[PDB]
Design a protein around this ligand. Structure first.
Ligand code: SF4
Ligand code: F3S
Length: 106
């Protein structure tokens, strides 16, 4: 599985979904997650994300390990998303700010 990590929050560009062959992105108000059992590890979404928030599970930074199970949990409850949409307003402002987990919306 690939995993969406902190810099997605409050950015949510959603360019990542358009290349996902198996449609395994799930949408929250201000964050996206990858369903780890649906994900086929094709890696195509990783270069598409301007926030550089996507990692293969084995390369998730030590200080973002929580996002691995968070992705698996939220993918069970959020609705699938399979089409590009406009980035969040002020996405640019939040791209690169750390610890945005504190702002995650359910
Ligand atoms: S690695 Fe491939 S299958 Fe997994 S979420 Fe990214 S684009 Fe989809
Ligand atoms: S910011 Fe989030 S919505 Fe996809 S393009 Fe990057 S993982």
């Amino acid at each position: 599985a690939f995993v969406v990590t902190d810099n997605c929050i409050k950015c949510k560009y959603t360019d990542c979904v358009e290349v996902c062959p198996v449609d395994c992105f799930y949408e929250g108000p201000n964050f996206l997650v990858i369903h780890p059992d649906e994900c086929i590890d094709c890696a195509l979404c990783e270069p598409e994300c301007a926030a550089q928030a996507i990692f293969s599970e084995d390369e998730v930074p030590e200080d973002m390990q929580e996002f691995i199970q968070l992705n698996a949990e939220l993918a069970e409850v959020w609705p699938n998303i399979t089409e590009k949409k406009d980035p969040l307003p002020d996405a640019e402002d939040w791209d690169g700010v750390k610890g945005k987990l504190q702002h995650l919306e359910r």
